[PDB]
A paper describes a structure:
We therefore generated a series of site-directed mutants around the putative 3TR/catechol binding pocket to further test this hypothesis. The residues Pro158, His246, Gln293, Ile313, Ile314, Glu316, Leu321 and Val536 surround the 3TR binding pocket and are structurally homologous to the residues that bind NADPH in the mammalian catalases. Specifically, the variants P158W, H246W, Q293W, I313F, I314F, [name], E316H, L321A, V536A and V536W were constructed. The bulky phenylalanine side chain of the [name] variant is oriented away from the entrance to the lateral channel and putative oxidase substrate-binding pocket and thus it is not surprising that mutations at this position show minimal effect on the oxidase activity. The catechol oxidase activities of the H246W, I314F, L321A and V536W variants were noticeably reduced (50–92%) with respect to the wild-type enzyme, whereas the [name], E316H, I313F and V536A variants of [name] had little effect on the oxidase activity.
Catalases (hydrogen-peroxide:hydrogen-peroxide oxido­reductases; EC 1.11.1.6) are redox enzymes that are responsible for the dismutation of hydrogen peroxide into water and molecular oxygen. The structures reveal a homotetrameric enzyme in which each of the four active sites consists of a pentacoordinated iron protoporphyrin IX prosthetic group with a tyrosin­ate axial ligand. The heme is deeply buried inside the protein, with a complex network of channels providing access to the exterior. We have previously shown that in addition to [name] activity, the [name] from S. thermophilum ([name]) possesses a promiscuous phenolic oxidase activity in the absence of hydrogen peroxide.
Residue numbers in the entry:
A (entry chain A), B (entry chain D): 21 to 618, 622 to 698
C (entry chain B): 21 to 472
Write the structure that this text describes.
C-alpha cells in the first residue's frame, strides 16, 4: 500500500533538517546574548518557512469533515449486471477511504450545524480508484451544475460581513429557495432530522444521480446507489444540536473516531435500485432529474456488499484534508447519465484539486494513489514525484514499441462509454419540461413522516424563516411552501405573523413512501457506543458505589459510560463543570446524589439538575436508580409514569428497562403538536 | 540506480489514468461521429490538464543548464581540519549530483553564450545533504547580496522589449559595470576565454566565498573551494561560439551527456586553500570580499578528493530541472563567513524554491531528498508526501518522550556555528573600507594572461562596447577600464571611436599569479572525447577506404570520429549539409576528396571548403591525409609549413602528428595582435 | 484604457518599499562593519523576495514570442453576414494586441528556428474581448485535440537529456510524423520557407479552423480567418537561419520593434472565406478537418478590415509575457464548429492560465482586462483586485433586484450558440471516415511551389 511506504517514525532519534542534517530548533542565532537575530540562521528560517506555509485552501464546499479507512466486501459475483471488477466475486475485498462532512461551513465550524452532509467513498479497486461522491440526502437542491455557485453563494455567509457561519437561517438562502423551486425537495429533507443526524454512523449515503451498470457485453441498466446504515437512522433535536455546536464542535468526528478505536467500526450495506433503460420516464418523473427519488415501492434494493470502516488516520492533514475525490474516478462496468447536475460535476472535481494542491500532481499524494500500476504519458508539472523511464511519451510511437497500449471495450479491460447511449436534437441551453414538477415529491416526503416528525420540520422552518429580515422574502417563501402543503404554509406563517396564501392544490396528494422517516424506522438495531451519563456525588460513599455497579452492568453491553461528580477521583470520568446533556444519549441519577438536585464553587449554579432536565426535554431515556426516586423526579418536573422515565431500586431491572429505552432512542410524546 | 525507488516503467502494459483505470487517449468522446466533444470525457480532460500544467518557472538565474549523477571519494581522513563526515576516511564515497549552467539566459538559450557559468554540487552525505553552489570564475561582480537584482536586471534583456537574450552586449549592462567598479574583476574573467569554455568538463568550479572548516573541538580555519578539472582548461574563440550558438544551442549538455555514455565521465580534484583566522586581512585585501582571489603563490591547493560524474539522468525535468540547491544545505564541520554576498544568498535560495515548486515541500522531491532519515516537527503544506506518526510535534514535550532530541556541538552530531565567531560595533548599512580597491586584482588577472590571450580579452571588450548606443556610457566604461590598465583603455577606445582618458596609475602594477591563464596552462592532459571530422566523398571509393582506415586508428585512442560526405551510407556519419567546423576539434580531409574543395543540390555552395577554412581560422589542427595536399591547402589559403597543419601520406604518421595538435588544442599564432 | 491607470513613473523621486516607505537598497544592515547580515533588514528581504519570485512558468507551447499594440478598422457594415459589433460600421476602430511566436522552443530560444509560428490577435471590442489565436500556416498537424500532448512531446526535446532545443530534427518527431499521417500537410508547410519567415511582418495569420459567422436573425455561415500581409511574403534560407540563430536570437522581435519605432508599423488585411453550411462536405474533404485548406479557387477572400500594429509595449513582462489568449474569448456574431481540434482547445486555454498566473483572477491583469464594464457573480480567489458592491451574487435573487440580468439571443446582446446546430448518433470515440485522406492536400501544396 502506498501509505505504508510514506510513514515516518519520530519516536526516536535526533532532530534533523528536511535534508537530514542534525540541528536544534529552540533558540535563534544572535549577535550577542541580548543581540539581534542573524539572517544566516537556516535552522530558524526552514522551520518558520514550513510553519508559514502549513495551510492549504479549504474545500470550496464540504470543508468541515472527517474520514476513516476500511474495507468493502462483495456479497456475490455481479457479472450478470456489471463488469465492475471490485464486484466480480463472492468475498472479494477492496480497501476504502470515506470522508463525511457538512456542506456550507468553513473548516472549524460545528459538526451539528443543520445542513446536508457528504458521504464520499473511495474504492481502491484492482482496475482503478472508484469514487462515489454522495450525500446523506438522496436528492439535490438544483437540476443543473451551472447553478451550483448560485446555490452555494446564497447559503454561505453574506459576503459584506461574512455572517452567518454554517447556517441557511438568513435572507439570501431563503431568497434563493423561494426563487428556485427545484430546491423544495432537498430543503424539506434538510429541515427534517436528516439535517441534524446523531452521527455519521446513523445516516445513510446516496449517489443521488442515476448512474449506469454496464455489462462486458455492452448492455446497460440504470441504477441508484444507496448505502444503508447497519447502526440505524437517528437524529438530534434542534435545541440539542445548537448547544452541542458550542459545547463540542467536533461531536461527529469524535463519535466516528471513538467507535473505530473501540472495535465498533460502522457498517453499511452497499445497495442499488436497478431499472431498465426503458423506465427512464416510467415512474412519473425523469431519472435524469436529481431532485427525485425512485420510491421504495417502485424498485427494491439489491444488496451488493458490505462497507466497514475500522481504522482511523495516522495524520489528519496528510490523509483526510488531502483526499481528493472525483466522480471522474470511474471504472469499467460503470457509466454516467445525461443528468445535467452530474455532467457538470465531472469538470469541477478535476479542476478544484489544482486550487487545493497548488499543482497538477495531486494524484501522487499517497491517499490519492491507486493500488495498481500507472502507465501513461502524463509528465512533469510542479511536485513531480515519479522518475519516468519511458523517454518516448507519445502515441503513436515505434521508439517505445507502441507502449503504453490503448485500452477499450475490446482489450486491456478499458473503460468504455455504454455503447447504447445516444444524443439527438439542437444544441440548446434549455431545461427539459420533464423536470418541471418541483413540488409533488417534497409532498411525498412530508406525507411519509410521523406527526411529531412533521412538527419538527415545521418548527425548523419557523425557526429559520423567523430570522429572515425581508418581509418580501418571507412572503415569497410562504408562496413556495404553500405549493407543497397548505397546512405547512399555514403553520409556518403563524410563527412569523403573516397570512399564508390560499391553498393551490395542483401538486397536493396523500401518497406516502417507505424508508424516509427517521422517527418511524423502528428501534435502533444496536446500542453499542451509545453514551450513558451517570450523575453522582463525592459527598456520599453510597452514590459512588451505585455508580460503579451501574458502570459494570452497562459497560458489559458496549455502552460508553461517564460517571459525573463535583470533582475527579478514581471511578469518576467528568466534573459537573465540563458535563452537559448533549454529551449523553441517556442520563441516570443515582439516588445517593439526590441532595445536588435542589450551589458550589466547582460548577455553575443548578448544573446537576440542568443536565437531567435538558436530557428529559430533548426526548432521552432518563431515570433515577436506587428506590428513593420521587425526590429527583419531582425537582425535575419529570413524571414517574412517563414513557422513557425509569424508577427502580433494583440495579438489574433498571438497566434492563433503560437499555430498551436507549434502543427506542427518542421519546417523542414529550413534544407539543400544532392545532 | 540512485533514485531507483522512484522510477516508473512503461515498457509494458495498457494505458491507465493516474488512478490506474485502463483508458484510451487518441480520440475525444463526441455526440455523433461529426459531433461536438463531451464535457464527460474525463480521459481528455485529465490528459490535457496534465499537459496544460507541465511547466514550472525557470530559475531566476542559471536557468539554462544540465546535470549528471556521480560519486565523490575522499583521499584521506580530514578530521584534523574538519568534522565533516563525508571527508572523515580515506576512500569514503558519497553520491553527488551536479548541475552546470550559464547565468543570464533563459531556459532555451544557447550553451555557448559569453557568460559566467554555474557549477553546483550536491553531496548526499551520511550526515545530510551538503551543497557547494559555485561558478567557473572565482570572483563575483558585487560585494553585497542586496545588489544582486541590480546586477541581474542590468545584464538581462532590456525590460521594454526583452532584447537581448543571453548577452552583456547592451547599454544597461555596461552602464552598471561602469557605475559599479567592484564589477571589474569578474568582468575581466568573463571577457577572457573563461566566458566561453569548450565544455563543462574543461572548466573549473569555485565556491567564490571564503567559508570555514570547523573541527569537532570548535577551532576553525578559513577556506576557499576549488574544483580542478582533470580534463584541462580550454576555451572556444568568440566567432566559433557565435556560430555554435546557432548550429548547436545544446553543445555543452550534449558534450557532457556523450562523455558519460561513452565511459569518459569527467573528473575534478576537489581542493581547498586553508588559512588561519588571523590571515583574514594579511594578503592586502579582505577574505570577506568576494571580488578577490587568494593568489596561488600565497596559499597552496590541498586536494581533498575526487569528483567523478558517470551517470546521466533518467528524466531531465524530474532530476535536472527540479534539483533545488541551497548554500543553506550545510553540514557539521562547515560554517559561513561574514561575506555580505554569501550572507544574503542564504535567504534567497530557501525562498526561491517556493516560486519554483509552488509549495513548501520541495525537499521531498526525489532529487532533493536526503539519503538518511528525517526527524522533525515540520508538518502539512501543499504536496505533503509523508504520513507522520508522531502526533505530538512540538518541543518541549513529554507525550512523545522528548523526541526528537535537540542536536548541537555536544550531542547528536548537531551543526554548530563556529564558537570563536563574534560581532562588535554599530548596526550599520555601510561598506567596509577594506573592500575599496576594485582595480588591483583585475590588473593582476590581465598581467597573468599570454599576449594573444590579452588580445582576445581586448577583442571581446571591443565587440561588446561597440554595440553600446550611449556615448556617455562608453566614456564611463573607458574611465573604469583605464583604472585597471591604460593600455586596455587605449586599445578598446580605438575600436569605438573615442579617446581613452589620461593614465591614472593609482592601482597599476606588474604582479602576476599562476593558474588563471587558459592559453598558458599547457597541452590538454587527455584528448579522449575530442572530435575529429574527416571530410570525404562518395564519388571516389578510395576516399571512403582512406576515411575508414583513419577512423580505426583515431578511435583506438578514444577520439570521436565523424566521417562526412555528400550523402549517408555505411561508414559515413553526417552529410555536408548538416556538418560544421563548430562540430569538430580537428578537421582532416582525405586526399581522394580533393575535387570537392573548389556546387551540389545536397549541400550549400562551398560547404566542404568552408568547414576546413573555418577550422583553420578558429585555431584548430587541420590536415590532409594521403600525400596530395597542395590542392586542398591552396584553395583554403592554408600554408603547408603552418603550425598545426599536417600533410602525410602515411596514416600512422598523420595520426601521430595530428594527436599532438589536438592536445595543443589551439594554434594561437593565427591571431593578429595590436601594435 | 485599463493599462493607463496602471502606468508607474520612476523618472523622479526617492526609492520606496512597495508600501510607500522611503528606503535604501544598496547595502545590507549588519552587526558591525565586517559583521553578519541582520534578519531585521526588511529592505533587503522585500527586494530579494521580489527578485526570487520574478519568474512565471513559460507557456506550454509558443513560449518564445513578442507582441505589440495596435488598431483594427472595419472597412464596412458587415451586419448582413455577422452580428459582431466590432464589424458593424464602416470606419469603426477597435484596439488590438498581437503576439507572434514559435511553437516548440523554450524562452530564450532563437526566433529563426524552423517551426510553425503563432499569430494571436486580441480585439478589445465594445461587446467584450475577442481572440483569434492563429498560426502562420493554415493547417495543423492533428485532427483531435486529445493528441496535442503526443505531438508536442514528440517535437520538443527528448525528455532524458532535453536535446534538441527548438527543432523537429530528431528521431521522436519523425517517429510521430511517420506514425501519424495526418501530420503530412503541416509538415510540408513547416519544411517550406513558411517554417523560416523573414519576419513576423512577412508572414500571414490563419485561424486554421472553420468557424461560424452568425447573424442577429440566427442564420449562420462557415468561415476561415486569413490575415494577409501588406508587407509581402518572404523567407530566410535555412543556412542563413542557422547562423542568425547564433548571431541574433532576437532577430524577429527586434525587426518588429524597430519597424514600429520608425513609423513603419506592419499591416494586414483581415479577411474570410465564407461558404454556406451545406458546403461542409462539398469540396472533397470535411470543413471540420483542420488538416485541410479551402483552395483559393473554391472560395475567394472577402476583406473585412485593416489590422495595423503601431505601438510597442512599455513593459514586456507585464504586457507581452502576461497576455493570456483564449479561443473561448468569443463575442456575439461568432460561433464554434464541431472541429475536434478546436473543441478541445476551448478547455485548454482556460485551464492553462491557472498554471501561468498561479491563481484564477488572470483576466484582471491590465493586458487581459476588457474596455467595457464587467457584471457577474464570480468572486474571491487569490489576487482578487475588485471590491464588489453587490452582496447578493446569486441568480435568481430578489435582494439585488435580479441583477445581473441574463443575456441571450433576445436580451442584453448575449452570446448564443448558432440555433441551427444539432447533434445525432451514438456517443463515440471514433474518427470520421471523412478525415481519412492525409496525403492529397500535402501533394496539392507541393505541386504549387516553384521548382527551386
Ligand atoms: C458543479 C459543482 C458541484 C456540483 C453541482 C456538486 N458539487 Fe460536490 N463538490 C464540488 C462541486 C460540486 C467541488 C467544488 O468540486 C468539491 C469541493 C472539494 C472537492 O474535492 O470537490 C465538492 C465537494 C463534495 C464533497 C466532499 C468530498 C470530500 O469529503 O472531500 C461531497 C461529499 C460532494 N461534493 C457531494 C455532491 C453531491 C452528492 C452533489 C449533487 C448530487 C454535488 N456534490 C454537486
Ligand atoms: C541575493 C541573491 C543571489 C546572490 C548574491 C547569488 N545568487 Fe546564485 N542564485 C540565486 C540568488 C543569488 C537564486 C535566485 O536564489 C537561485 C536561482 C535558482 C535557485 O535555485 O537559486 C540562484 C542560482 C545559482 C546557481 C544555479 C544552481 C543550479 O544549477 O540550480 C548557481 C550555480 C549560483 N546561483 C551561484 C552563485 C554564486 C557562485 C554566487 C556568488 C558568489 C551567487 N550565486 C550569488
Ligand atoms: C489541446 C491543446 C491545444 C491544441 C489542440 C492547440 N493548442 Fe494552442 N495553445 C495551447 C493548447 C492547444 C495552450 C497550452 O493552451 C497554450 C499555451 C499557453 C496558452 O495561453 O495556451 C497555447 C498557445 C497557443 C498560442 C500562443 C498565444 C500567445 O502568444 O500567448 C497560439 C498562437 C496557439 N496556441 C495556436 C494554436 C493553433 C492555430 C492551433 C490549432 C489549430 C492550436 N493552438 C492547437
Ligand atoms: Ca443574508
Ligand atoms: Ca468509449
Ligand atoms: Ca539595454
Ligand atoms: Ca582563450
Ligand atoms: Ca529524439
Ligand atoms: Ca523559400
Ligand atoms: Ca501556486
Ligand atoms: Ca445558447
Amino acid at each position: 500500500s502506498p501509505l505504508a511506504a510514506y510513514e515516518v517514525d519520530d519516536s526516536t532519534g535526533y532532530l534533523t533538517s528536511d535534508v537530514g542534517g542534525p540541528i536544534q530548533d529552540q533558540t535563534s542565532l544572535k549577535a550577542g546574548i541580548r543581540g539581534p537575530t542573524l539572517l544566516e540562521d537556516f535552522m530558524f528560517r526552514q522551520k518558520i518557512q514550513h510553519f508559514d506555509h502549513e495551510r492549504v485552501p479549504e474545500r470550496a464546499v464540504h470543508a468541515r469533515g472527517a474520514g476513516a479507512h476500511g474495507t468493502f466486501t462483495s456479497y456475490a459475483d455481479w457479472s450478470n449486471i456489471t463488469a465492475a471488477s471490485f464486484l466480480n466475486a463472492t468475498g472479494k475485498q477492496t480497501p476504502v477511504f470515506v470522508r463525511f462532512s457538512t456542506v456550507a461551513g468553513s473548516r472549524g465550524s460545528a459538526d451539528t450545524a443543520r445542513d446536508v452532509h457528504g458521504f464520499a467513498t473511495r474504492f481502491y479497486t484492482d482496475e482503478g480508484n472508484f469514487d462515489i461522491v454522495g450525500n446523506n440526502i438522496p436528492v439535490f437542491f438544483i437540476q443543473d451544475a451551472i447553478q451550483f455557485p448560485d446555490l452555494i453563494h446564497s447559503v454561505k455567509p453574506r459576503p459584506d460581513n461574512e455572517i452567518p457561519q454554517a447556517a441557511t437561517a438568513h435572507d439570501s438562502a431563503w431568497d434563493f429557495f423561494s426563487q428556485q423551486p427545484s430546491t423544495m425537495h432537498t430543503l424539506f429533507w434538510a429541515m427534517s432530522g436528516h439535517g441534524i443526524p446523531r452521527s455519521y454512523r446513523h445516516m445513510d449515503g446516496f449517489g443521488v444521480h442515476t448512474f449506469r451498470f454496464v455489462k462486458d457485453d455492452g448492455s446497460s441498466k440504470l441504477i441508484k446507489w444507496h448505502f444503508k446504515s447497519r447502526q440505524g437512522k437517528a437524529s438530534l433535536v434542534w435545541e440539542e444540536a445548537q448547544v452541542l455546536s458550542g459545547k463540542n464542535a467536533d461531536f461527529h468526528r469524535q463519535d466516528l473516531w471513538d467507535a473505530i478505536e473501540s472495535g465498533n467500526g460502522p457498517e453499511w450495506d452497499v445497495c442499488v435500485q436497478i431499472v431498465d433503460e426503458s423506465q427512464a420516464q416510467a415512474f412519473g418523473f425523469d431519472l435524469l432529474d436529481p431532485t427525485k427519488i425512485i420510491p421504495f415501492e417502485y424498485a427494491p434494493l439489491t444488496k451488493l456488499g458490505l462497507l466497514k470502516l475500522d481504522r482511523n488516520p495516522t495524520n489528519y492533514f496528510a490523509e483526510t484534508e488531502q483526499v481528493m475525490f472525483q466522480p471522474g474516478h470511474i471504472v469499467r462496468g460503470i457509466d454516467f447519465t445525461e443528468d445535467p447536475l452530474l455532467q457538470g460535476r465531472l469538470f469541477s472535481y478535476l479542476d478544484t484539486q489544482l486550487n487545493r494542491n497548488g499543482g497538477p500532481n495531486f494524484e501522487q499524494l499517497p491517499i490519492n494513489m491507486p493500488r495498481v500500476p500507472i502507465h501513461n504519458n502524463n509528465r512533469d508539472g510542479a511536485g513531480q514525484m515519479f522518475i519516468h523511464r519511458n523517454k518516448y511519451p507519445y502515441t503513436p510511437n515505434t521508439l517505445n514499441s507502441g507502449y503504453p497500449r490503448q485500452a477499450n471495450q475490446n482489450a486491456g479491460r478499458g473503460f468504455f462509454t455504454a455503447p447504447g447511449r445516444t444524443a439527438s436534437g439542437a444544441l440548446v441551453r434549455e431545461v427539459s419540461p420533464t423536470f418541471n414538477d418541483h413540488w409533488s415529491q417534497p409532498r411525498l416526503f412530508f406525507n411519509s413522516l410521523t406527526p411529531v416528525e412533521q412538527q419538527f420540520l415545521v418548527n425548523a422552518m419557523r425557526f429559520e424563516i423567523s430570522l429572515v429580515k425581508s418581509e418580501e422574502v418571507k412572503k415569497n417563501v410562504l408562496t413556495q411552501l404553500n405549493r407543497v402543503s397548505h397546512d405547512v404554509a399555514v403553520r409556518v406563517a403563524a410563527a412569523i405573523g403573516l397570512g399564508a396564501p390560499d391553498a393551490d392544490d395542483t401538486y397536493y396528494h396523500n401518497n406516502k413512501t417507505a424508508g424516509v422517516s427517521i422517527v418511524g424506522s423502528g428501534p435502533l438495531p444496536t446500542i453499542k457506543t451509545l453514551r450513558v451519563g451517570i450523575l453522582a456525588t463525592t459527598s456520599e460513599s453510597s452514590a459512588l458505589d451505585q455508580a460503579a455497579q451501574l458502570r459494570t452492568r452497562l459497560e458489559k453491553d458496549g455502552l460508553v459510560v461517564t460517571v459525573v461528580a463535583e470533582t475527579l477521583r478514581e471511578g469518576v470520568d467528568q466534573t459537573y463543570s465540563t458535563a452537559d446533556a448533549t454529551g449523553f444519549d441517556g442520563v441516570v441519577v443515582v439516588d445517593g446524589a439526590a441532595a445536588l438536585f435542589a450551589s458550589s464553587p466547582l460548577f455553575p449554579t443548578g448544573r446537576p439538575l440542568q443536565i437531567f432536565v435538558d436530557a428529559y426535554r430533548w426526548g432521552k431515556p432518563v431515570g433515577v436508580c436506587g428506590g428513593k426516586s420521587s425526590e429527583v423526579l419531582d425537582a425535575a418536573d419529570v413524571p414517574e409514569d412517563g414513557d422513557g422515565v425509569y424508577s427502580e431500586e433494583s440495579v438489574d431491572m433498571f438497566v434492563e428497562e433503560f437499555e430498551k429505552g436507549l434502543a427506542t432512542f427518542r421519546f417523542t410524546d414529550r413534544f407539543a403538536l400544532d392545532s
